[PDB]
Paper text:
Peptidyl dipeptidase A is a highly glycosylated ectoenzyme that cleaves dipeptides from the C-terminus of a broad range of oligopeptides. AnCE is a single-domain glycosylated protein that closely shares enzymatic properties with human ACE (in particular the C-domain of human somatic ACE) and is inhibited by classic inhibitors of the human enzymes 14–17. In this study, we elucidate how the natural peptides Ang II (the principal end-product of the renin-angiotensin–aldosterone system), Arg–Pro–Pro (the BK-derived peptide) and bradykinin-potentiating peptide-b (BPPb, a snake venom inhibitor) bind to the active site of AnCE, revealing novel interactions involving several enzyme subsites. Comparison of the four structures clearly shows a common mode of peptide binding to AnCE.
Therefore, it was not surprising that the structures of AnCE in complex with BK and Thr6–BK showed Arg–Pro–Pro bound in a similar fashion in the active site cleft. Strong hydrogen bond interactions with AnCE anchor the main chain of the N-terminal Arg (P1) at the S1 site (His367, His371 and Tyr507), which is also involved in coordination with the zinc ion. Furthermore, the side chain for this residue is stabilized through contact with Tyr496. Additionally, both structures bind a citrate ion (from the crystallization medium) at the same position, making contact with the N-terminus of the bound BK (1-3) peptide. The citrate ion also interacts directly with the AnCE main chain and the surrounding water molecules. The two Pro residues at positions P1′ and P2′ form a strong interaction with AnCE through hydrogen bonds with residues His497, His337 and Tyr504, Lys495 respectively. The general mode of binding for BK (1-3) appears similar to that of Ang II, particularly through the various hydrogen bonds with AnCE. Experimental evidence suggests a preferred affinity for Pro at the S2′ binding site and highlights the importance of the hydrophobic pocket (formed by residues Phe441, Phe511, Tyr504 and Tyr507) for peptide recognition, which allows the products of BK and Thr6–BK hydrolysis to shift position and ‘register’ in the active site subsites. In both cases, complete hydrolysis of the peptide to the end point resulted in clear visible electron density for the tripeptide (Arg–Pro–Pro) in their respective crystal structures.
Numbering used by the authors: 17 to 614
The structure:
């Protein structure tokens, strides 16, 4: 009888979820030890325990067939069983899974161990991406120096792992097909529980794309005035090494040379943070303060005891790209961040604490539900707070922004600064997964893999390498997430929905009213708002217990992912920028790049 079996199934799930949490704890501890301290021994430990968990997952997926779960009355039970059928990489045969783990750790460790020689001192070769190289890329205005560090990094972080990346693509594809997905693209897209998700994103992107073109055109115009026409052409793609970021993903670091009104204030609180004696500990304490001020959960003692919030001063290798960790017990959550005292890093702290808050909010859920409504939701949480932290309103409250006059021109400066991070990022994020999807789907021949990457970067972002590349180079893995096998569409989703969350949180806080000039969206601070916090609690506590539109509905009553909010935020900028580009006869669009030889 199905009635009797469904009762037994509920008991089966309750026990299994608890077992899965406990087994995942062990894997997470080994992964933590490796990420904090990269050694051959720790790699072996991490990968052996993962292989053990994978074997158990196989048994679980096999055991689900003993239950007639598709026939059950409970949508909740059926959802849990469905989650258990999805094996991912664990679907691979024992030997193939072990090889993939070896391949993945080889790529991540390569990225983490990259060291380059100093541009001025060829005998000093201990410059790592974080913080040495990134500091130069963000601060230097010497185009030849920038080009040097670009080439050195991409050669070492990208090209060096071509063979490993090829095997990764093969095994990822094999895994996807064993789960009966067409490719790893479909496997990744399954996390969004919507068969029209790609088209939805194409539609939203197409709406925002014209604004991006205007920003691109204006930045190119301003860069020409700084570097001269020998470095930057009017009609070509922007040389990417000039954009203040190794991957040209966000351009805020060059705001001082491209700001609409250079004689008016531009928010850069890094210097005032240092003057006031800010430390990584203080920054995390301030993040904790922001969450608690919204009536959300305080960081547990385990977080303070076990987190790594500064780059270790011994000679050891580690993954410095910031991460948050859920150990699937009670209150055992951690962050690993090589944090520096800068404005950008203050946002990163809040970003990572957003993940931690999500962990704490759903820790009461059964194991399979202890994850985000979709991957984009998890990435969005901290960014909503970062948007308010970034406002002149908030920065003045914490004494980091002094003698600031918020006139029309200063507002345009701030909107443009935000756009250099939020709008600029959209085509970048889309191309990261458009690229990997095309490889996963077998749409690009191996002989064309590198120029296929740069073709997308050209088509969507209108940027190009500083030097001519070819199929002898392999540049994609020079981006952390590509070497680390981290799906990237989550960030495109995040950057869209975070404005939906921000707008609604601001309205709930009484901080935004479209008909009130005194309450603009771009100066909303949700600090101290219990009303905004309540919306977060209602959504985050759900975890993955319901499809993501139900989680969005819990927040603000909406069920649709929409670009309306992000466009609303930047509308005052759009109006000004379109007019400024016409006034200055600014060329919009770009010719096809010549920087990748087929
Ligand atoms: C991805 O898709 C794959 C298909 O492309 C899929 O692989 C299939 O999984 C099926 C299991 O659901 C499996 O079906 C079984 O087939 C057995 C015989 O197959 C052999 O010969 C085939 C050639 O004809 C070969 O290709 C195979 O390699 C095999 O050598 C059958 O013996 C078996 O049957 C038994 O089970 C059914 C199922 O019963 C169900 O559950 C209850 C039980 O209480 C029933 O009441 C209910 O009605 C329901 O039917 C019983 O009905 C029956 O009495 C037997 O006990 C079964 O049909 C199939 O072989 C396999 N491969 C192929 C090529 O089809 C993967 O599972 C998919 N992967 C994922 C992750 O989803
Ligand atoms: C700082 C630190 O924790 N270092 C550890 C070290 O103690 C250990 O010997 C090694 C084993 O591979 O892993 C690393
Ligand atoms: C001032 C305020 O609204 N405080 C809320 C309280 O009403 C609510 O009961 C609690 C539950 O988490 O969260 C907090
Ligand atoms: Zn994140």
């Amino acid at each position: 009888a199905l009635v009797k079996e469904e009762i037994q199934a509920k008991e089966y799930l309750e026990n299994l979820n608890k077992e899965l949490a406990k087994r995942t704890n062990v894997e997470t501890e080994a992964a933590w030890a490796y990420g904090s301290n990269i050694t051959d021994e720790n790699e072996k430990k991490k990968n052996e325990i993962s292989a053990e968990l994978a074997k158990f997952m196989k048994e679980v997926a096999s055991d689900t067939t003993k239950f007639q779960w598709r026939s059950y009355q409970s949508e909740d039970l059926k959802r849990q069983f469905k989650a258990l059928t999805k094996l991912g990489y664990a679907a691979l045969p024992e030997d193939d899974y072990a090889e993939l783990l070896d391949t993945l750790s080889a790529m991540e460790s390569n990225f983490a161990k990259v060291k380059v020689c100093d541009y001025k001192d060829s005998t000093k070769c201990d410059l790592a991406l974080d913080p040495e190289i990134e500091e130069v890329i963000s601060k230097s205005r010497d185009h030849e120096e920038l080009a040097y560090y670009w080439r050195e990094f991409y050669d070492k972080a990208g090209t060096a792992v071509r063979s490993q990346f090829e095997r990764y693509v093969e095994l990822n594809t094999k895994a996807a097909k064993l789960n009966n997905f067409t490719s790893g693209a479909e496997a990744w897209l399954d996390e969004y529980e919507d068969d029209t998700f790609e088209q939805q994103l194409e539609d939203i992107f197409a709406d925002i794309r014209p604004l991006y073109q205007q920003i691109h055109g204006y930045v190119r115009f301003r860069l020409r005035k700084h570097y001269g026409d020998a470095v930057v052409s009017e009609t070509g793609p922007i040389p990417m090494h000039l954009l203040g970021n190794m991957w040209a993903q966000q351009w805020s670091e060059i705001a001082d040379i491209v700001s609409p009104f250079p004689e008016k204030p531009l928010v850069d609180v890094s210097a005032e943070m240092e003057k006031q004696g800010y430390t990584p500990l203080k920054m995390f304490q301030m993040g904790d303060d922001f969450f608690t001020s919204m009536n959300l959960t305080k960081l547990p003692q385990d977080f303070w005891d076990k987190s790594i919030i500064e780059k270790p001063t011994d000679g050891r290798d580690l993954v410095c790209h910031a991460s948050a960790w859920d150990f699937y017990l009670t209150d055992d959550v951690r962050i690993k961040q090589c944090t520096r005292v800068t404005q950008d890093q203050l946002f990163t702290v809040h970003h990572e604490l957003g993940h931690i808050q999500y962990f704490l909010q759903y820790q009461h859920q059964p194991f399979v539900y202890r994850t985000g409504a979709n991957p984009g939701f998890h990435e969005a949480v901290g960014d909503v707070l970062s948007l308010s932290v970034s406002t002149p309103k908030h920065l003045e409250k914490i004494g980091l922004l002094k003698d600031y006059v918020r006139d029309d021109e200063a507002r345009i400066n701030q909107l443009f600064l935000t756009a250099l991070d939020k709008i600029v990022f959209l085509p970048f994020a889309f191309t990261m997964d458009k690229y990997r999807w095309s490889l996963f789907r077998g749409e690009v021949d191996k002989a064309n893999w590198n120029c296929a990457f740069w073709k997308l970067r050209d088509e969507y972002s209108g940027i190009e390498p500083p030097v001519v590349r070819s199929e002898k180079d392999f540049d994609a893995p020079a981006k952390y997430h590509i070497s680390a096998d981290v799906e990237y569409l989550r960030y495109l989703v995040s950057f869209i929905i975070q404005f939906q969350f921000y707008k609604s949180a601001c309205i709930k806080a009484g901080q935004y009213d479209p008909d009130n000039v005194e309450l603009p969206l771009d100066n909303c601070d949700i600090y101290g708002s219990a009303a905004a916090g309540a919306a977060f609690h209602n959504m985050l506590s759900m975890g993955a217990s319901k499809p993501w539109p139900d989680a969005l509905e819990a927040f603000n009553g909406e069920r649709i992912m929409s670009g309306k909010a992000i466009a609303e935020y930047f509308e005052p900028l759009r109006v000004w920028l379109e007019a400024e580009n016409i006034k200055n006869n600014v060329h919009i669009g770009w010719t096809t790049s010549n920087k990748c030889v087929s």
